[PDB]
Chain length 75, copies 3
């Protein structure tokens, strides 16, 4: 069903958005610690954390694109 | 009204997109300065700027998700 | 045509998503190399790569916003 499939994808998007919100909270906390106590080791960890955060954004966009296709098929 | 609400959310998305465009312009400028004059202090500031930019993307995605829900209710 | 225009924009989104997938693959590879062999020179290159990746996300979001407007006009 078009309606059921769209809601399923929107629920996946909701879960991805919440995962992103949690990751943003962690990233902002280590950013404040980086500003207080900078070092090469801290920067490397911070860069790695940014990349993980970007990967969550990419998944969020992938789901958005899937919802758009389902909508276009429904209309 | 479904039509009015969707347009309101799209106007919020338009404003978020413009905020992101301005932030990208700033971020690219400090990236060119980082490449010219690297240092730990410059890297820490740059990492902090990336995180702020990512936070704007996250807000843009949040608005997109809200528009998708309004569309699904309208169809 | 509303249908043709939406499909054209979704094809542009598909191409942008694939560009992002390729960039993510590169970014993850240099992140693993950063963790193995950190240095200031490696960090500067990594920061520059993050910014390029973020610019692809921004373009993906721009296309998404354009698809949303076309959908709203079609419904």
């Amino acid at each position: 069903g078009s309606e059921y499939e769209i809601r399923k994808a929107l629920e996946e998007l909701k879960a991805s958005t919440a995962e992103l919100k949690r990751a943003t909270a962690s990233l902002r906390a280590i950013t404040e610690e980086l500003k207080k106590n900078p070092s090469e080791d801290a920067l490397v960890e911070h860069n790695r954390a940014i990349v993980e955060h970007n990967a969550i954004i990419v998944e969020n966009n992938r789901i958005i694109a899937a919802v758009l296709e389902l909508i276009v098929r429904a209309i």
